[PDB]
From a paper:
Two different space groups of TsaBgl crystals containing triclinic P1 and orthorhombic P212121 were obtained at pH 7.5 and 8.0, respectively. Two TsaBgl-P1 structures were processed up to 1.9 and 2.1 Å, with Rwork/Rfree of 0.1694/0.1952 and 0.1599/0.2019, respectively. The electron density maps of TsaBgl-P1 and TsaBgl-P212121 structures were clearly observed, except for the partially disordered electron density maps between the Gly302 and Gly304 residues in TsaBgl-P1 (chain C and D for Data I and II, respectively). Particularly, the L3 loop exhibited two structurally distinct conformations, one where it was oriented towards the substrate-binding pocket (folded L3 loop) and the other where it was oriented towards the solvent direction, i.e., away from the substrate-binding site (straight L3 loop). Particularly, as both the folded and straight L3 loop conformations were observed within a single crystal in Data I and II, this indicated that the two conformations can appear in the same environment. In the P1 and P212121 crystals, the L3 loop regions of the TsaBgl-Data I (folded L3 loop conformation) and TsaBgl-Data III (straight L3 loop conformation) chain A molecules, which showed the most significant differences in L3 loop conformation, were carefully analyzed. The substrate accessible width of the substrate-binding pocket entrance with the folded L3 loop conformation was approximately 30 Å, and the proximate distance between the L2 and L3 loops was approximately 5 Å. A Tris molecule was shown to act as an inhibitor of TsaBgl β-glucosidase activity.
β-glucosidases (Bgls, β-d-glucopyranoside glucohydrolases, E.C. 3.2.1.21) cleave β-1,4-glycosidic bonds in disaccharides or glucose-substituted polysaccharides, thereby releasing non-reducing terminal glucosyl residues. The substrate-binding pocket can be divided into the glycone, aglycone, and gatekeeper regions; in addition, the bound sugar substrate is cleaved via a retention mechanism using two glutamate residues.
Residue numbers in the entry: 1 to 444
Write the structure that this text describes.
């Protein structure tokens, strides 16, 4: 008796700038993250993705390695600067990489899940205003249309955006991510144009009416807990919950922004970008929702720079990201989606994983037993979601390999495969051998 059906998709995930390297090869021009990584201090130790895992050149080895683990699906992102290295200038050599990547995946019985935008905005777009310029909806739409036309016969599962909360608030309000602005109003406008650009891609995708092809979006979601039962900490929790989750779930699945947060933000910045026609485009019916889950947040009243809510450390074990290990929130979020937002729509966990201080032993092994226990605990919550009626179609572990972890550089290792960057050698961690066995047995 299987806990994961034979139809269930055990997968792994990467992103273009985090793994590909070859940053100026075959016509690729800079993205906002190439630029950001060269701004003094914006990436830890001045790391960048010039070479990364060199997946652009080693992809056939990497696909073979995934075949040998039993991987059934592979979530990757397509680099906009490879496809349109300048405004209105298509680059066939960039497309060619994703066609030969896709061909290798299909020959190895691996189902491709393609993320259209995973933060590597072309620099030419940002120089015109980027996500602050409403015309990006058209530039993104033409970019998406080109991918559907050239790849839609071979890629059948499409994700418009990865984690728009990061591309908006983390990039334009907190400023940790490219382009690194620090203005709440800009972040709110960016979040709207991201969602509107998502709606343009869905509209284009529906018009093409490709056989057996599905489209969705990926959101990073948490569960917010008040530090105490006080009314003040409950209000702080509502703010944090709207900031992370409801600000994107409500427009996508209810067709409106959460009104409490519209009022809250409106005390501090402009919210005049809201209108009915935009929200109708944003709330188009999707085929699935991809969920990125890593941790919960415990919040108390206060204001330390961001909004009127301060996250605290509750004192439990954390990963090397400083993120609390809290698997139960994976079930709570998935059930919350089923009850309040997505109903019986298919759901995918498009990222879950952990960063630990991995070391290669004298015999060539990586005994990452903390990551094994992390993945076991979270797959058990996915199993419990399926047992309680949830429509979970797949689970993509982040990540296939250690890679460039954005503002942390290479200092944080998420992979089930260890990468020695000096030699680009791949080393299977014990978590990879455990995942191979889980795929074979499908019971946990
Ligand atoms: Na790269
Ligand atoms: Na750099
Ligand atoms: Na991706
Ligand atoms: Na939908």
């Amino acid at each position: 008796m299987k806990d994961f059906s034979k139809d269930f998709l055990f997968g792994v995930a990467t992103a273009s700038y985090q793994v590909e390297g070859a940053y100026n090869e075959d016509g690729r021009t800079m993205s906002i993250w190439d630029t950001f990584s060269r701004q003094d201090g914006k990436v830890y130790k001045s790391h960048n993705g010039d070479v990364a895992c060199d997946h652009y050149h080693l992809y056939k080895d990497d696909v073979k390695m995934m075949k040998d683990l039993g991987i059934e699906a592979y979530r990757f992102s397509i680099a906009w600067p490879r496809i349109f290295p300048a405004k209105g200038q298509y680059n066939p050599k960039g497309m060619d990489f994703y066609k030969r990547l896709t061909d290798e995946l299909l020959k190895n019985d691996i189902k491709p899940f393609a993320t259209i935008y995973h933060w590597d905005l072309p620099q030419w777009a940002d120089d015109l205003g980027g996500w602050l310029n409403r015309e990006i909806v058209e530039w993104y739409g033409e970019y998406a249309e080109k991918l559907f036309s050239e790849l839609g016969g071979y890629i059948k599962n499409w994700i418009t955006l990865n984690e728009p909360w990061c591309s908006s608030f983390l990039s334009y309000f907190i400023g940790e991510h490219a382009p690194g602005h620090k203005d709440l109003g800009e972040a709110l406008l960016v979040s709207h144009n991201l969602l509107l650009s998502h709606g343009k891609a869905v509209e284009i995708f529906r018009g093409l009416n490709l056989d057996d092809s599905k489209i969705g979006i990926t959101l990073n979601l948490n569960e917010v807990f008040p530090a105490s039962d006080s009314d003040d900490d409950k209000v702080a929790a509502q703010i944090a919950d709207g900031f992370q989750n409801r600000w994107f779930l409500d427009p996508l699945f209810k067709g409106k922004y959460p009104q409490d947060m519209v009022e809250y933000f409106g005390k501090y910045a402009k919210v005049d970008f809201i209108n009915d026609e935009d929200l109708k485009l944003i709330s188009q019916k999707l085929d699935f929702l991809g969920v990125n889950y890593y941790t919960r947040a415990v919040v108390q009243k206060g204001n330390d720079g961001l909004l009127d809510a301060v996250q605290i450390d509750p004192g439990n074990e954390r990963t090397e990201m400083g993120w609390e290990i809290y698997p139960e929130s994976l079930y709570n979020i998935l059930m919350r989606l089923k009850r309040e937002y997505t109903y019986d729509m298919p759901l995918y966990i498009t990222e879950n994983g952990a960063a630990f201080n991995d070391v290669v032993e004298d015999d060539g092994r990586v005994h990452d037993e903390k990551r094994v226990e992390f993945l076991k605990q979270h797959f058990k919550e996915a199993k419990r979601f399926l047992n309680d009626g949830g429509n979970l179609k797949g689970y993509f572990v982040w990540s296939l390999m250690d890679n460039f972890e954005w503002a942390h550089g290479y200092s944080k290792r998420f992979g089930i495969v260890y990468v020695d960057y000096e030699t680009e050698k791949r080393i299977l961690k014990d978590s990879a051998l455990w995942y191979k066995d889980l795929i074979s047995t499908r019971t946990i």
